[PDB]
From a paper:
Here, we examined binding of the mink angiotensin-converting enzyme 2 (ACE2) receptor to mink-derived and important human-originating variants, and we demonstrated that most of the RBD variants increased the binding affinities to mink ACE2 (mkACE2).
Interestingly, a comparison between unbound AmkACE2 and its bound RBD F486L or RBD Y453F showed that the overall folds of AmkACE2 from AmkACE2 and AmkACE2-RBD F486L were very similar, with an RMSD of 0.520 Å (for 577 Cα atoms), while those from AmkACE2-RBD Y453F showed limited change, with an RMSD of 1.573 Å (for 594 Cα atoms). Although most of the residues in AmkACE2 that are involved in binding to RBD F486L and RBD Y453F are the same, the number of van der Waals interactions between AmkACE2 and RBD F486L is much greater than that between AmkACE2 and RBD Y453F (322 versus 157), suggesting a moderate conformational change caused by the Y453F or F486L mutation in RBD. The hydrogen bonds between AmkACE2 and RBD F486L included AmkACE2 residue K31 interacting with RBD F490, E38 with Y449, Y41 with T500, Q42 with Y449 and Q498, Y83 with Y489, and R393 with Y505. Moreover, AmkACE2 E30 was involved in forming the salt bridge with RBD K417 in both structures. Furthermore, a π-π stacking interaction between AmkACE2 H354 and RBD Y505 also contributed to the AmkACE2-RBD interaction in both structures. For the F486L mutation, AmkACE2 H79-T82-Y83 formed a hydrophilic groove, which clashed with the hydrophobic RBD F486 or L486 side chain.
Residue numbers in the entry:
A (entry chain A): 19 to 613
B (entry chain B): 333 to 527
Write the structure that this text describes.
Amino acid sequence: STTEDLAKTFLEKFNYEAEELSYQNSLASWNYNTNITDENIQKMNIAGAKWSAFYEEESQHAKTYPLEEIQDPIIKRQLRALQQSGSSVLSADKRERLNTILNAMSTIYSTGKACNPNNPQECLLLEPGLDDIMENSKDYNERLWAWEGWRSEVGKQLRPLYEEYVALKNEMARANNYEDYGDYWRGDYEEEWADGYNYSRNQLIEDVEHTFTQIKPLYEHLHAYVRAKLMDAYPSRISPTGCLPAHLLGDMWGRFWTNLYPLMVPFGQKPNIDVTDAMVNQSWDARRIFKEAEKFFVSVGLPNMTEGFWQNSMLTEPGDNRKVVCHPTAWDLGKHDFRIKMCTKVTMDDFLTAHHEMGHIQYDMAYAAQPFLLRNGANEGFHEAVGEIMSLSAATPNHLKNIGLLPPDFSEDSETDINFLLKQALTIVGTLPFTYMLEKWRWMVFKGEIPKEQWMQKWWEMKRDIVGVVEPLPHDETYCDPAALFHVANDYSFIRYYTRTIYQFQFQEALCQIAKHEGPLYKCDISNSREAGQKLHEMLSLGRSKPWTFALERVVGAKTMDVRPLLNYFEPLFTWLKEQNRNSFVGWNTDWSPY
Amino acid sequence: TNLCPFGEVFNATRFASVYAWNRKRISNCVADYSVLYNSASFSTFKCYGVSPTKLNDLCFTNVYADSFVIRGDEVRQIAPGQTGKIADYNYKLPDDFTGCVIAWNSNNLDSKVGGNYNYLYRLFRKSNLKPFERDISTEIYQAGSTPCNGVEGLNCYFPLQSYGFQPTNGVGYQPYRVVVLSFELLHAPATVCGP
Ligand SMILES: [Zn+2]
């Protein structure tokens, strides 16, 4: 009786009991998110606690079989996903102490409000009213108190909780044979027991840092063009050779520069291609958007949606007393129950979102034959990278001419293409120094390179040096400015957004070579090409049964992440950026500050 | 002028599980297999050995009807020479099988909101089943060598597992009422002719 057979017998009992019980958890979660009532919250929590107690009982049973004695590679990947202890390795007092901190940080963030110093009766929460200031207002002083007040009235309260969060999460990391909690978070990309596809936890630092040094020529010309246009929207507030203030970046945290696009448009006389009015004249509804969305996946070679997809999903707002979470979520309930829940309007943004969320479904429909512990993406960034390339192909004017949303005599304009490429680069290239620096600060904090008396000292020294973003007001060590982000105060790994962006154009450049696309990469459309969807289905059907380095090579031919496909996408913009920045200064110095 | 009651088998309100399948002995009657193939309601109609082209001229001895409910992904395991949890531990067909496998989707009948757990399938067994062998015993299956002493714990599992049949499930995870007609053509009076 070898332990390879005792773990294989254990997984057959586990996988059917997990799929039976997580489906009841997913169906109770679906009945909450579409039918928000008092009974559905309790039934979600009752059926969620049964799944959360079953998974911890069998995690201790999975540690009976030694992982070194298992020879089959499929069983080891399922056992490592099940033997991964978390807070259970702590004592009874410390595990209750850790969940007290995690619940307190998630409620200080969600129920925290910043008050206006001019009018103290206006105290605004983040999601309803404080994100409205940081994404729509064009005033320096109005965005200043919303930025400072969010990190003073809320982020200072998270500073004594985050310090004990670091010590407790480093204690359970070192009890699970890890160096720190940052090394624990880098184990999501760790691949072991492979011949040439091994990926170490230290190799994730050596790949993210190396890929970022090549986006620096692209980001500096984007930073210089944003600074040259933000010094017109905000005169005598930004030095022409310095950094950008943190509250002028179109976001609360400066995560995305997308909202600055009305302040910097390359050709104001050439409007962007917006087909939201062609759908109204053709009398499109919410069903027509998803029927045209699935025609894109049929043309690329992916199968149709299931019969139970159309009758069980919520593709429109019900128009009744049922409260509905209207965020677009693609649901993999298990037992081949695939759903999309979004309050779809007849617009262009929901047209591309319907392609993005159905690309999540086509990933979920592909690894459905895998075992239950292997029914996920290859890593934490593989799943949203597949959905993002569907919105890239759908938004092209070549695809909007074939489905009737553009006239047949629609001549493509190069001036409108620079407007499209700059708007893409404000969301994509503008978020990569923010995503790199947020994880670089957090990895060094867990490791011990940054002492607790140098948290906000090294937070702003890194943000000036890497992101080129200077704080508008001085912050001492009582602040906690990364904790003002959602993924920091709610214990989420933020490197999932960096690597997904690298995979997004690595997948896009790989599929547009088999699609025989002649021209630049941003004009590519993989529709009506059964070779760029069969190649994508080779990686999609793997799931988590193989390492992500193996899954990357099955599409792009390279095991590691590569940012040169991302630089090829914005290469027509990068030629335009270097011509526009010939009379400006490209780069920044960290000496200049607004204070 | 008695006829073979296929309405008792196919249109039954209660169906058996696959670990304990309900075999009915049908003899001394007149059968009409042309109505079975031309019903257009069966999602699976695969006859093995005997051709399904309305052979209403062969006299058979006994027509055993094995009625059970499995999920839709396991209907392919009711072919002669298949492997899986159903073909090895629940219902084994011989490699010289001469009969038909009728299976239709019964998501309207055998699915309830919250789950229909009245159908059980044997998940673990010490060895594979013989052809046409039924095992209704529920002893505790030990995976290795440690004794269970009548209680299932570490490495001891209860061999029966319950199907969760819900109407919102996918087509693969959906209840299929499977009727396996078995024909025994031997040196016999061969009562079931059905002209
Ligand atoms: Zn998504």
